[PDB]
Symmetry: D2
Subunit: 203 residues, 4 copies
């Protein structure tokens, strides 16, 4: 994936269009929306090259997964209608919130199927451990994992997704559906929160 370095300074907010209501709440733009798009376009092709023979169930991990999920699937849809290659897709949504699971339940749709799990970020890798444990209970034919972000953290068990958008430093990022206490999901760029932001939006 795209490696973002520890000393990556990001961009000044005044160079980009940002939501009026978060103008004072962000410190820098970390990953511009357009960069996320470009990288996701390539990821869609990588997904096709890998899982292209088969019908796939795309499993969206809510809430933060929703933007990456819709965009990735859209790029995949563009391939399906303009190429000879093909991945017929059905979709499913799951939420993990010590980790409670909502919406599976459900989920025999996964049995004997090719599963593409779609996540916003891998940090400790624990959420993903909980998910795979539940997916195992339905006996899928194949499981692949795509994550927009993978965080470089010593708190990691060492788990790595098949498809990675960006490998990022051990910093807390928001935007592109990633939240701080449910705020900042309504933001297209991945960014870092300012001092004012932390205090204003703290729980």
């Amino acid at each position: 994936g795209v490696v973002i370095s520890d000393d990556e300074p990001g961009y000044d907010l005044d160079l980009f269009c940002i939501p009026n209501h978060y103008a004072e709440d962000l410190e820098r733009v970390f990953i511009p929306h357009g960069l996320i798009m470009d990288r996701t376009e390539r990821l869609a092709r990588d997904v096709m090259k890998e899982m292209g023979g088969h019908h796939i169930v795309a499993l969206c991990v809510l809430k933060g997964g929703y933007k990456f999920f819709a965009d990735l699937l859209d790029y995949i849809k563009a391939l399906n209608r303009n190429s000879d290659r093909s991945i017929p897709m059905t979709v499913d949504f799951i939420r993990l919130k010590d980790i409670k699971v909502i919406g599976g339940d459900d989920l025999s749709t996964l049995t004997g199927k090719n599963v593409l799990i779609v996540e916003d970020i891998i940090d400790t890798g624990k959420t993903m451990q909980t998910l795979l444990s539940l997916v195992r209970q339905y006996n899928p034919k194949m499981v692949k994992v795509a994550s927009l972000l993978v965080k470089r953290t010593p708190r990691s068990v060492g788990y790595k997704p098949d498809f990675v958008g960006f490998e990022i430093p051990d910093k807390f990022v928001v935007g592109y559906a990633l939240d701080y206490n449910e705020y900042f999901r309504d933001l297209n760029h991945v960014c870092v929160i300012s001092e004012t932001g932390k205090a204003k939006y703290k729980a």
Copy 2:
């Protein structure tokens, strides 16, 4: 406005004039609402939402599964206004699924005293919507509004009208733009009507 009126005698478009996924080439009969028309209409709807809810925080409630495409696009159009004006609608997002079984039901307590925009793919009998409204109302939100991409002209037992409507359509079964037939056709950008071979292939 009651949205864009698609006539009862609308023929739709020959599949050959559009790019459609090859795996559905035999399973569809006509494109009924082109993806791009949906986007154009959704852009206007975001501006309508901004005019009616602007300068206020909203909880945007996505009704899975079929609502997910309209939800993402509408929110993207709203975000475009948010970052290009000094008028702004700060938004938080939530998800719910109705299947009548309700899934994801315990973030509904959090709606108390809030402004809620429910986002749906379609209103047919209206029973899903009425069920969902009464559920939200149990938690006393300050305000509830409903946006629905499609509303069918069909007899309804109550005369409910959503606040924002993309298109008013004939009483025909449509698929695409996340609307399904037995989970198929969600991976299709256009709204379409299904062929007889489509109905048979994917019949549950």
Copy 3:
């Protein structure tokens, strides 16, 4: 093949259902082809061009000014296809204005040329253009026009690629003008007669 056919009795859409620049609000009658529909049609056209001319080098020739939007989007869709397993492209621009006047075409020589136009009406412009272009000796010439107007005032011209076939009404938007106005409008619309009076 004759493209998306828009009927003579087509009502179009009420302006109030779309986002439209305020400065054109009272000057338009209806929306005829929503920007997004233009996009969806142009995506298929890209694939049609890739099917006909694929695997070979192409000069894409933009006919200014009205052709510029269709040209940009059509090429963007072709480039999208090119990022998958290819039509290498160079580009050029030409303007014809009406006696029809022209505004170096040596590039075209021995190449496969795709002329990109906004609209064919009488077909005069296109005969004028093909006449000149063929004098620079290209290997092949194909013509894409977003719009072709159904008219008794015919030569006419059948382009190889056609977006929409429309009624004999004066349209503006998506870079087509009325007296240089309305190019900054993303939808194709029918101009009002009261609208025509406002832009001289």
Copy 4:
């Protein structure tokens, strides 16, 4: 604003991290500025243009050929601004090539807010000539996607990116007419430079 500053030591991106035109696979070395970044910056530039020029009728002048992509995208963002706030002004367009080749009469620029749209400013001699010609418009401003750091000291009013003294192609910028059909700003490889050599 000097725009988004791209340093001299900016390495850019490995080609395999992005979707690249198949036919340019060996002809490029690095992605230098991703298309998505260009779009993000252009969106902001659009709002900057409207903040300054949106008070009166704008004539947008496209400098062919390399300016065509930037021009199209910039105006679409401007059109988006103009159709989502109840305040707007008409905008007309023209096209020129710099030898000045083939726009409308320059008297169409009188009394208007003229916006010149360029792909790149290097020395800046070209623009200085055009500017010292275009002049009684109500106002003239220049938007350029790229500005290089042997200049004669001209700076445009709106800058997308400030780049090193490197030769770049893509987003309609060419090497001998090639590479215009490329969405990213990139750097040519040795293979590329000699394959399309003049």
